[PDB]
Amino acid sequence: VNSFSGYLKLTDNVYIKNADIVEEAKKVKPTVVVNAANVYLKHGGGVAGALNKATNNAMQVESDDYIATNGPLKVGGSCVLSGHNLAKHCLHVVGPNVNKGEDIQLLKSAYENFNQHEVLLAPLLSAGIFGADPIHSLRVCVDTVRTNVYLAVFDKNLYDKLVSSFL
């Protein structure tokens, strides 16, 4: 038993809710919150910008030190950093960004990072301002992640559509 509330059970291991991930992180304080990162860990907009703002820019400060030491991530890759005031850890995962011209096939590799954590609060990867089909992202999530994932979807009308179209 965990502390996530009002999530709709989609599969054995995948749950979904229409909610602001920042709020959900603030309320649950999960072991792991997933950030929709880019390879530079430049948290400007979307999930990344919203989480970083909620940390008072501490996420960005930590991230800049990470990049200065290690260089950029790979598309499809991830790193574990602090969750600051939102979670114990933040798993920064780089889904392919369609609007930047990156290969959507890399979405499965991105979701594989979730399997290294038993439970996660996460966004649907590559959706929103990343430019991919969210119905597609949810399908890849369900077909790739085997650990317990609680998906917070910001957009109400997208949420209604993801549930109604889920196979």
Cβ atoms of 36 and 164 within 8 Å: the answer is no
Q: C-beta of 11: minimal distance to ligand QNF in Å?
A: 19
Cα distances from 140 to residues 28, 35, 104, 125, 166, in angstroms, run: 25, 17, 11, 9, 12
Element spanning 35, H or E: strand 32-36
Residue 111 sits in the site that holds ligand QNF (CB under 6 A): no
| In the complex, minimum distance from the CB of residue 50 to ligand QNF, in angstroms, rounded to a whole number | 3
Nearer to ligand QNF, 32 or 47 (CB): 47
Among 46, 76, 83, 96, binds ligand QNF (CB under 6 A): 46
Q: Is 36 among the residues that bind ligand QNF (CB under 6 A)?
A: yes
Q: Is 50 helix (H, G, I), strand (E, B) or coil?
A: helix
Do the Cβ atoms of 93 and 125 come closer than 8 Å?
yes
The residue of the chain with the least Cβ separation from ligand QNF equals 128
Which residues would be at the binding site for ligand QNF (CB under 6 A)?
20-22, 36, 46-47, 50, 123-125, 127-130, 153-155, 158
